[PDB]
Symmetry: C2
Subunit: 252 residues, 2 copies
């Protein structure tokens, strides 16, 4: 069985270091049940304190990184900077960056290749928008994205990739995703991997559900056979995060 994986994405939160420290102390006291690999992603500015203070059985992640080691890229944070502090993970391709910050697939593949070649592990995000969901073309859209991702992955690095499916069509659209939606698209992704890079890899890669995950739906989502975990949004800031981490006991 693949090890269940839960990434907590704080996004651009909290507002103060005092709040981030309080949240860390809450995470540190949580009793994890079952078996699960937990990663916490936070704003660059809080990454030093998170790495220093977060429980050592969990790992810290950046929410984005640039494509280069360093250079004339005012405002950007790079792989060597966060790796120099012991941070092993980054999220790439999150819907908010693809959209608001206009990150395209070419930019994202470069990031994934550079990050992996430089020893990082990645949570690579994908997912289709409302028009493609409505048109019933969700699998084609998601395939194209995964197909741009695939050649970024060096030989031997699939152990360092996790994929998160975001139902962007259910974010701020008036539509909601069902548990079966989540299962279906995670299976779509697994099958794309099997067809393109082989069953051995497909059978080991964790594919996460990245839509709305809360204490009230995490257990039924975890039980879906192709859902290997979550990239959690707003609940990653709340005590409910632990219920989600613990939903691993319902996945087999």
């Amino acid at each position: 069985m693949r090890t269940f994986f839960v990434g907590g994405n704080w996004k651009a939160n909290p507002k103060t270091v005092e709040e981030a420290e309080k949240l860390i102390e809450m995470l540190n006291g949580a009793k994890v049940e079952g078996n699960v690999e937990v990663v916490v992603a936070a704003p660059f500015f809080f990454l030093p304190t998170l790495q220093q203070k977060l429980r050592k059985d969990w790992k810290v992640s950046a929410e984005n990184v640039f494509t280069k080691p360093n250079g004339a890229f005012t405002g950007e944070v790079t792989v060597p900077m966060i790796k120099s502090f012991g941070i092993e993970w980054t999220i790439l391709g999150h819907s908010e960056r693809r959209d608001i910050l206009k990150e395209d697939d070419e930019f994202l593949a470069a990031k994934a290749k550079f990050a992996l070649e430089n020893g990082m592990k990645i949570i690579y995000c994908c997912g289709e928008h409302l028009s493609e969901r409505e048109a019933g073309k969700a699998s084609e859209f998601v395939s194209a994205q995964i197909e741009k991702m695939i050649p970024a992955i060096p030989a031997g690095k699939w152990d360092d990739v996790v994929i998160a499916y975001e139902p962007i069509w259910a974010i701020g659209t008036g539509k909601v995703a069902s548990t079966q939606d989540a299962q279906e698209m995670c299976k779509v992704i697994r099958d794309i991997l099997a067809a393109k890079v082989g069953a051995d890899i497909a059978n080991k890669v964790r594919i996460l559900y990245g839509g709305s995950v809360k204490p009230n739906n995490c257990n039924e989502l975890a039980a879906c056979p192709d859902v290997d975990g979550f990239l959690v949004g707003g609940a990653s800031l709340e005590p409910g995060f632990i219920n989600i981490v613990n939903s691993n006991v319902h996945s087999k």
Copy 2:
């Protein structure tokens, strides 16, 4: 006389926290001559250590910030986060972000308004590209940018604005800027301010030269009457930074 102002922009450098700490220890030992306001901008990830360890007579600056207090903006760092740690400054509108990260004037004006309304001080960057320089339309282009900036500034906040002119036309183009180029464009900007917001404000706002500044040209640049200081690139990482900070003795 306006107080001479030197901002050191590390850009996306150095690669490691060990290097940033060594650079800080170098800055801390430097003997400043004359009178000058010094700000050091560094990657988000190094801002905590810079704020903790940098000499207290100088101030730390972010190299960019987002337009919102917090929220669903994966990868972004916000004003309250850096203000919560005592950081008072940010750079906005740097050419590398306008270009590589595709930041437009509307995005940048929003940042400046939000930053200022939230108690930040800003270094707002502007500057024209090669085609406008060649066409002799450098002043019109720069005016338009400043004209988008101006309504972002709340009543009473001009004391918290510094403007940096970047001769983008001389970055990676095969063309170099002269000392007279720097003076001319800093004067162009001052005159736009005087005409649009009044002489009192124009006479107090520091306008910096943001092109290539090194130990070998800083004294002649500082002596230009409308050049009030520098936003320094690569030399901000080198012992030469101090020669630049000290070029204030040549400006009157």
